């Protein structure tokens, strides 16, 4: 997980916000899987009662 945080202050200040009154925080990642033997995965589909 990659996290980037910028608290309000001088670093936030720009021409769009000359006072630097805002901030943000974000998170991102990569994911993926590889299936070698599909026949070993079994599934059953049914309805369920109330």
């Amino acid at each position: 997980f990659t996290v980037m945080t910028k608290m309000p202050g001088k670093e936030t200040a720009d021409r769009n916000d000359p006072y630097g009154e805002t901030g943000f925080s974000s998170i991102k990642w990569y994911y993926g899987i590889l299936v070698k033997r599909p026949e070993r995965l079994a599934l059953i589909k049914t309805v369920a009662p109330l």
Partner: peptide
Amino acid sequence: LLTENGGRV
């Protein structure tokens, strides 16, 4: 006067 989130005012 500014606001809570003020820019280009």
